[model samples]
Target: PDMDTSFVGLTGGQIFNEMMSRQNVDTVFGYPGGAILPVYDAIHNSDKFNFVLPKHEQGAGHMAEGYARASGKPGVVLVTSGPGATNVVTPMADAFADGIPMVVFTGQVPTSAIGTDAFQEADVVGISRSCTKWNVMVKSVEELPLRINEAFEIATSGRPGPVLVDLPKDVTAAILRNPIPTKTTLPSSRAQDEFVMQSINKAADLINLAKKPVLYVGAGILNHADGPRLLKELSDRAQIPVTTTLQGLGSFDQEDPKSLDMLGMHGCATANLAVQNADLIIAVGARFDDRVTGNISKFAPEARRAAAEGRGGIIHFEVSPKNINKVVQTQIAVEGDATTNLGKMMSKIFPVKERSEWFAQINKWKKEYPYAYMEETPGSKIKPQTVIKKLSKVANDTGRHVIVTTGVGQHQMWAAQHWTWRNPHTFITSGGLGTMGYGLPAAIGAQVAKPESLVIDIDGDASFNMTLTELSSAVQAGTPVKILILNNEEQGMVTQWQSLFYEHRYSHTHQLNPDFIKLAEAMGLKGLRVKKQEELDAKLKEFVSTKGPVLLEVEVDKKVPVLPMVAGGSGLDEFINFDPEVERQQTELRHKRTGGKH
Candidate 1:
């Protein structure tokens, strides 16, 4: 129903709540304060939506992010002035970097006291300019509806990201005799249909001609409603192997025979090598991030050579025009929504010659250098990789939909490598920004978004400590989010880097961690600890079966490093594969260096 413009005597808070209700937003994640009390109070009276209050404003933002990713809706966040507004910067930047859609409302000081350093005052618009897709301060109560509409549009549209709306206390408190309906002023569509179709046709031509081709998929494909299905259709119809970026997991089933799993720094050996040797690189909604394309100069030499030779090169299908040729040159640039463009390209594609030799080579590489881990002894400490693999198996046995979230580091890579991601939005993680404390709160948000699914946060000890306080919020909300802590008592990724490149100078990376089990109990949640390989299966089963929020700390070996790592400035094909004998020799050398007397 259209809002009754003739209805008189409406506060800005009432109008804000009305707009949210009209948009069909059911849940909002936030923390309240004095400045934003008007909106909070207005919503309190109306049963339009539920507001989830996190312990900190940052948790609210990440929770919103998790909600957005899981539910395929623009996550809405509300926070008060100054510290509240400032705290969301990390998640805003994170959303911007990874293309998660979010709408954040920050309370500002009264309009009259904007420039003055009044209590709880901060220039949210200016502070968040670089991080947000669009940001504005509502200058008048009449303009609030339009701005709210605009914020959602910008946040969820083409190459989606976070948008901020700074609401002054006076703006929310102001009373208006007459309210007016407002619509978004954004341009409805891009005027490049003919050009886009031409590019799609050209891309199809290249795909048909190329003998060795690889499809590089990313998050852009997953942004659209039918993206994942269309991507699979195109890949299967054209018989091209698919490799996804870290953020693009689940877009293409990793269990598929044509799957290369993932590509980049800690990606599969087969995936990286396939890209290095491919004649054609079809990038769909994927930016050639530095992590993916290690050394841009040396990356995909064969594909670049193919382009120069007028054979087959790179075809980039992206929604954002700026990202089409931003990182790597594209032979055909299809600039539009990935789902629509992929569908169009699929129509133009015809059956081409199958490259049996290419598959044979990839199969050989996969066989020789699978994501290998050391065998666990019954009495020894649990290996982190074993835990992840076991968790996947246990979750699969339950026959329930599972959503896995991860904090950034070695554990994040392990989760990505081991878990079977068959559906889109099942695996959520801090991708481009690599935020450490993203797991627990994100799991809670995912739990809220999909109450029936099993949501787990696979976190590292160092990362878990960053936002363990959110456990209280989870308990209060009654969200049964499982926390799997791969505890090595060190900043695992940082330590790996120090070991590999910094002469093992072990800086501040080593951490003295807390007893997570006791901490969970302190926060009114269940906690479990597993130290030995023998205890892992039983503990994990118990942890998974437990009710409410539970934290399981699995003590893992500290010295293990993520394998198949492409060092900084090195080519993806030049990644360091793990060698058991060589690692054994290095361990002996390290032992001798420390000496027996010590």
Candidate 2:
């Protein structure tokens, strides 16, 4: 009955557990099913793991993502066969989109039952092929440990991503005769240091001669522990203004003097303007996604055309070779580990001390078109922006290990725009996937991984309802994660588009929600509803100070739209300030210009 992998031999499940222990994985998020019962039983017998049971398999995946994002570790997930594996596809896609490190294990039918329409069977590997970084179907117990261990290595290596290992039922029960490999070798990255340095050196030549240069930072910079520090040193030493993608929020302190904060749709006007006008763009750990590059031909036109033309160029530093020329082309593509290459590149570059004109222009843009909102009136509707401001204040004032997560929509943009992120990984969101129900489960995962940290889920009404049942899981686990639901009573982002573009044809965007407060109480948690503007500060404090899981639904104005929006298909400079009177006049003028078609 000895379960060791030496002469005594071990079951596949036993070896899996042993591998988890050796890999430093303590918490696992999963759901149990018949096909996966053997592995679940092994988990029960072993004290090496603390498995968190989520109501849904998708919830488990998101929780794993939260744990990875907050703890800076590769999160593990276990789910049963058939429907269980299929249910986790959303989260797999989510993790893939953001480049989060995860090892997902899916159970399958017995090897003998392959393609015979066995009960609860599935082609888990096939389903996960496009979403996972690498995947394998274990054929026997002898290869189970190797495959599982390899998945971990693949997930955590260069340009980290999720990997899947599909475990057949029979394999989990079979005996493993071979000992596990001491270590699994990962495939080498496309980058060699010599090639990367050559590119960086060429970039240095371009950067040194450029007058208006910009450092565009991305989440890849956050992947390394040395990322933020190196970013600060390089930018400050070179006198380069910094702008970040949505996923790169906390990598550079937003409070820094040269911080352009963010660029793209719903981003700061000044930041967008800076990008459009910069002579040289040093893209560090950032790919030119469509969100950041509006009207590709027009984006950063100054850097590529006219006055600057041959003088201006782009230098891209990325770990993944596939990212090169995938979106926007770069003159010098430095493909290597961002942290290592940046250190080397920074060491070689001489400091540029004179950029007063560039700094003065950026400072002017910041002062002239800063991120602003309407002042809150005494007895009117609550502004979502104000709440975002307060959340940042509360997070700072408490000096807590606070992690902020957001659901996709206007609330998400407001949170991104308003939150004062001081460190990397503090602001977590489904950046690439734009998943709606990501906030709560991610917060739960973060809180579970770091019990001392305060995890906050800033969700929109529509987004909160998408995965409200996770509240029960949070309460049951005694993980006091806080939720701030901005109840706009509609699909805020969708409706905003409808109002602006579709001629106010608000079709099915209205959200008919339940009494969130009552629902929270029914789920064995605390709840509060805040309608008045005066009680916002007190209510927020109470919501965070509660001893258990809690939800606070702030009744927000449904019609108000996120301002300073860059209309789709437009250039970054073509931003529109959301002003009612101003918009009405423009609409009338458009109609007049079009010969009164209305």
Candidate 3:
């Protein structure tokens, strides 16, 4: 139905309500800036809905991203005009790269003063273009309904991404009589026969010919794979090895026998070798990004030769001949949505006569000892493994439903590698866009969404400061959101890389933390400082007993490395995650453990 004239003397807040109704948005996340007073006034007494206000606008963005990514739904952010809106960009960008659906509603300077670069006015849409999937700059009240609906449609459709709406203050304050629009176009769900059939045949042909074929997947595959069942069906039917990218982790039944190691930067050796050495490569929705397939020309040359080595053979799939492409030169190029197309393809494939013999080799790699976490780290005051592993234990034991938020660096990687995410929605961290200062605010947003859920914000000191102000929000809200600050006392992620690739010229990685306990107290929150492993249990138990927000600081390695890194821009199967300690232990435990050289 067309939305024509309907409402009378509607204000911006009313327009917002109408817009929200159309989009089916549940709640808003953010704080009111001075420029957004009109919205605040309207939002004052809305018992029908509520807004989750974080200590800082920045945390709101991360929490919003966390909620959206974890739930696979569009998370909304509401902020007063200017800087309030601008701050959401960091986490918004993270959500975009990770394919999280999100919408940011930012108030702006009055429409008349927009170009004047008025007190807080900046080109939010312009600044956000590089990151946002699509964004809007609302001019008048008449445009609100249509634009708001379009924004959500755009954000949730196609590859599911973030969209922003910059509303001028005047437009929000305007008294208007326009009706809200209800519809927008969506991506075609129909599968084109030529492409689908061709690709299906290609996959079959590849599997039929090569005894050691492998399925290389990316984030897009997860979006379409529809989870572990699909992955199992595809892998078991073809008897081919399968692996997941960073964003694709947990997409497949990780414990399946056919499941190989994770593929890409920080991937296991087996995952990389299987991909690099395979005779037939079946690339699904993946873009064949560099991180997954290092040095393209040299990447799996044997696979390329086997695929193109034409002779009388079963041409199982062809990728709709007329839709020929160079990206497929090395292997079969199947182009279709993962869920529907793969489901159809599954019906066509039967479990091959031969179970993947290559699975044994990948299994060996999967069992390969990698990732070092122990009770004690000599140079550092605490062992990396001890800290992260304990945290994992604590979360699991409490049956306390919580989302773990992380800052980028070795700590983030360790957490991912160590955390046994029993629940699908439990793991929330930056994978694609590694933004600093994302952890704190994001945890706040997650808390807001699930008031009963606890959030363990695992971040370093550098990234912590980016949104430390939000700690106040947790205390003020009276929510017991626990923050564990891993104080290696350095900008560890970048510095670790600098040490490895560069000449170990330490940059500004050296950073200091204020008395975190005192700082937490200053904000009306409990702060616990435990310098020894002996005190970890006592402090954590005591803090939890208090039943309020608190900060736990664990000092760790300042120069430790995030191993098994496949240099960025490499292929999904090109990196490594071998535990340095494992290698040492297996090789007679004779290697003198050099403290810092990666």
Candidate 4:
């Protein structure tokens, strides 16, 4: 059959495969089950795509997320009904919260059996409604092609997120005769174009008039095609200091002098303080997450007051209108594509005044309260921060493109704190959802997505243990992703909290970990461990330069905590900056309380 005539005679499964091909999806992470047998049968003899079978459905979902984040394409996943569908909820919510585009095709029972609670049945659509950007159940084979096409479009456009297309068993089995081409219709934003243009103009005015302006960037900027370049241009031309959210790490070069690095809960002190004192905040594609804006009542007080006085204020450039003024009020909200509006605003943003005083103050803050940790001693356990720093150095020296993925906890913070991020899509983590066990699967997915790049998972022991079974998946797929586990033998973040809030009760946070080296060797991969500070650099270099899937376990201090922490109920400026003296005091107190056990 010719290309145009191919759809004339096809089963729903064939149509699904064709649509995926049309969408240029070359990799899919999924698991097969009873209900999804027909779809599996369709691809049984097909070599059109590479299917990665993960150990768990959650791993499959997270792998897709990593693929999407790494490649700037909608990650695809296929799973069966009931538990298979339910297991993906976490990654779906993670992608939704982080605005990563993904299309998950979940198998469902036959349409008639959906409400009957037949074997492997589920309310996939209803259950996934809150998490997915859009979801639909394909009741008939005729609509299967359309739903799949719409799923990809909806997942990738506007504020990108995960979308679900539930495929009932019968729908996949039924055949379509003389099927016509399907066209997807999306909501038009032309109605708000004029308003957006006006908002952009007002935003440009604010930028041109303000002397103390800060760019509060987020993952939204990285979502656009030329977001990073445009962002850099704007920041350089406007002479504005940039402070990015955790998810926005690589959007702006952290090594650049204009960057405030990361801001919020565990962000750099200067970054947080800059936002607190700025007269104008230009928030691009950021949702004003609570972690970034702690205690909304006191968040960005100066910018809020400036808005109230009409001199300088917050200008939000976001694709989602709901996020604007949802937490912190905005004087100007440009609800449209960030790249488009940013380009428009750039043309009108000529500097109106000098702000040497603001720069001077920010420089002083950077000098005074840098993101630092206690220096490593000769015979002490390795500091997790030191491991990350050495890893970053070794990875850079290798001169290969490096992509870092991390699980939730202290290791994630350390990786973010130490890495010299210079490009977008290089750092992938569970930002909004803070999902644990996301590292290994994500690393595998990213390596699969970008085969030439060095994909590293900077994971913690507790976090790595959650998804370690995926090592087999990595080996089977031949994706040589690196796993660097900072083994603290405790749930470091929780332990730190216990130390700070509960007076070192030394609760159930301590963990007795399995021998990671033995575990990696069991999976037919190389394993290495480092317990001394002197061996860290050499081992890390060997770890990064290795050829295949390898696991490196670095023993880190158990009592160390992530510093520059803004307590849950405090403002951004109210963070507790890192101090060696304070850390020593905390350690002594913890030792006294726990009888030197921890």
Candidate 5:
């Protein structure tokens, strides 16, 4: 076949661009190095996509995560062989655990030299195989287009996740003489199989009949554009109190009366209590992960017993059949598209308008042991909760497309607990993997996706240092996302755990930190430091109002632990409630151990 020039051509570069354009990819985050020069050249020759270079490959991967989370599209990343390939392992694992859709392109050693350990040669397929949804090594030039197409299909399809394509140097240079297909085909599924229909009816019956029913939502709400509203409308109409996994935080409006916000280790006390007491647990696209389930064997014992006793039952509405009862057992499991199942359920059951006994009990718990922390006093040190609460005020008030991203720690929990996530995809964080260095780059990606939006990274001291170099990328790219570092001068979360389980035996948990203010200024970014409670509000206003990238280092007390803590393997009801009694107990233990300093 003659080269059309409009279609496939001789080199792999042409095939790569053709497939990328077919997939409608608008941006890629990566770094160019040896082996991948051809792909970089192709990207440069075709002005169809924007290539963003981050300070590190990890940062690039997180940026893609932010983009995928914000836009509901597959984020693309292109890195060279060996170290460049290995650098992306973290993000791959992060995306896999969190269920983020991404397409990763890695340049490989020439086909002949693959096993010779040539320069920049590494088994990227082997490294990424466990973390990715699907992966393949391109054997020749002609197969490049289809392989890339399959990568996109697998990535954006059911249970959205990342897919990798390993391209050899020789393949990139080889010529393609075959006709090119405009787009690759995706495998199909029956809209509603008989089995799925039977299960959907059962699920509807469970929701309608049970007085104590809870709608447990997860990350799958982001798959379809209308998913969030469809699920929310169903829950609202059914008068079902809703609780979400951290990944599904913003799927339903936090301010809604039925919304219980987030649930899990650092989740809302009211939410956890309600889930435990519910007679029927309706799980939607949630995998019952350790963080959410705690002790898997003991999770929702009341609901389990109710089902066993023929009193109540559990129903799961999931996209993948493999996930049905994968962790938690259920009476009925609907395996189909989430949005489709919700629509079917809505048609079967009418909207619920009246309050039930279940909601009254949930409301009682909310008022009795509400999520709270110490208030700011005249001489008291700055509390991380105070900073997060203040930021929450701004986020709720700021009439812009706002996003809040965080690293893993106490500050992350504080941000999640305090911020009112009113819209879908507005509260993006490293939910499943809890990756520490995710805040800055994720914020940058979100800002890139919507340049007019307000993106803020609420991070901890140790977590901030892990990917601080990305601040340079933000400054260079002209992303004005603000960073608020809760400086506790230690590995706050780790120390808190050590104190609880290890009986105060601390190890290398202290963070003898650096001067972050100077560090930010050195990168031509604005920096502000606040030491007292009085200057807090004014400085926060200044930080948010600044036109360019800025960092606010908040000097918070290192001793202020994230309260209402739940032990890893403990049940939902098991919590170290932070209150006057707990504080007094700590004080008495300290005095007894120190012998009153006499």
Candidate 6:
């Protein structure tokens, strides 16, 4: 009754009208279904809220999550109840693990039709409870305001997660509750008792006690925190150095003197060493993912020292204090929000003269494990890293300025290791979620969102077909998203593993691929294929110089694996670079800590 002349009228769909009014929704990813007809009919007139209808609903979730990670805003996704809603499972699990902000709105048949699991009806909220932070099912017009308001709030609260709202079909047809304006505020407190003094004093004590110390900053520091300054400050103060998680890339300046690039899978070699050899590791917001700690017990075996527990004594891996973990016999398990907690810790810390020796160790590692671009691997198949770096360097040089989005496996790790992201959101991938076939559509959405940036989708050849149909959407939107296919002609990472561990038994991992360049041409877009490293090096600039979207499939050997990796379900101490020589060198570094020959 009160829906006259509101922003709701502009969106047509009652739910769309409501969401746009909040000015929070940037875009909507969805698939329509039975109970959502009224909302769809209403949406036909609105252009304010750009609605992205993907071929498969899963693609919608990936695109939404990409937008959220890039924009640092709450991701919004929609689907009709039941079958349509099921499509977003992969993306939801990803958002949960990665700490993404989102609200997923699903349409149900009717309130009367629910609870019996009607046709095309499933318990969307209940099913997502374990994955999402919270959920709601709107029962009546009376509950819309409360349910909607609370859903968004819960989605963004604490660790920030996905929230589900199931709206019945007739419910969208009914009048929404009369608008009652309320103040929008986020829950601020995720810290307890000013432990800043305690953490600072303890860190200072550890620095004083240990000759070699390091800071392990994780991805928790990347999204919404003062991690950069803390990383720089601690590196400067204690004279230690820092590294990051797969999700933690770009949290600090990689070019800094203290940075060891990254540690874990595809992490910098020196950074990995820094973790293994440390006398104490100041674990920041970053958790030690298996990738970071190969075998949790073996990682940082020497680093028992304390950090950020407030003024205390210098004792490496003091299992007694229990503030942070020691690779040997200590673990810190206090839980709270990273940003606020770190902000408090900063206050109590006093700047030191500098930890020059620790800085030297980090510098040494960077020199030994430098970030260099090489086209040819001696006595080996030419790989994608060289090509990936070239694309990154050129795209960055052009006015097209690149944003890197990737699918899982070797390609994702290669992008992370080789590409240079100047800021936080610049590095986009399924960090915690690790979704496959996400690159193409995500690239399209990214280009559409920021027209000035050249959105580059670096996809594994094997992972490209999942959301591949969205190539049409890119053409329709007229968004120039350059797709660089890291085509290895097979499931490269799997084959690498099968070779290394499973006795080179490459079974269903290998596959044949269509000429993707021709496929792109068929899609009404420009295309190119480069088989050799030199061919790619020659044509890269010219290929990128064109206007509109293009797909460049660099067909590479399908046996490549991201190297110098810390294997999962193992200790951070055990790793392989796929070369007997490099592993020998890493063994020497380990021998440095253990005071014995392996």
- Measured over all alpha carbons after superposition, the RMSD of each candidate to the real structure, in angstroms, is 2.0, 3.8, 5.0, 2.1, 2.5, 6.7
C-alpha lDDT of all candidate models, in order: 0.88, 0.85, 0.68, 0.88, 0.83, 0.68
In model 1, the runs with Cα more than 4 Å from the true position are: 1-7, 181-191, 592-598
For candidate 4, list the clashing residue pairs, or say none. none
Better by TM-score, candidate 6 or 2? 2
What are the per-residue Cα lDDT tens digits for candidate 5 across 307-352?
9887777888788778888887888888877877887778888677
lDDT of 2 by residue, 235-327 (tens): 887888999999999999888888998898888888898889888888988878887888887888877762346786788888898998788
Per-residue error (Å), model 1, residue 345: 1.5
Clashing pairs in 1: none
Model with the higher TM-score, candidate 2 or 3: 2
Candidate 1 per-residue lDDT over residues 298-408, each given as its tens digit: 899899989999899999988888887788888898887888888877878986556688889989988998998775766767888889999999987888889999998
lDDT of 4 by residue, 473-541 (tens): 999999999999999899989988888898888778876789899999999899999987878888988
Candidates 5 and 6, the one with greater lDDT: 5
TM-score, candidate 5, is 0.95
lDDT of 6 by residue, 1-598 (tens): 4333232223224645565457467577778887777677776656757788777888788777777777777777878888888778777888888777778888888888787868899888878878887887777654555566787777776667788888887777776444433332111133534454455455554456666666677666665646566657656665567677777777777767677777885687888887777766666666455567777656665653333332221222111132244333333333455555555555454555676676776676566666443347554445688887787778777865567788888888888888775566566777765777878877766775677776778898878877778777778778787888888777877866765576556678866777787889888789988776557766677667768988887876545557776676655545554564654454454456436521
Q: List candidate 6 segments past 4 Å from native.
A: 1-16, 177-191, 195-210, 225-239, 305-336, 369-381, 399-401, 568-570, 578-598
Lowest-sum lDDT 10-residue window in model 5: 180-189
Clashes of each: 0, 0, 31, 0, 2, 28
**Please, what is the TM-score per model?**
0.97, 0.94, 0.84, 0.97, 0.95, 0.85
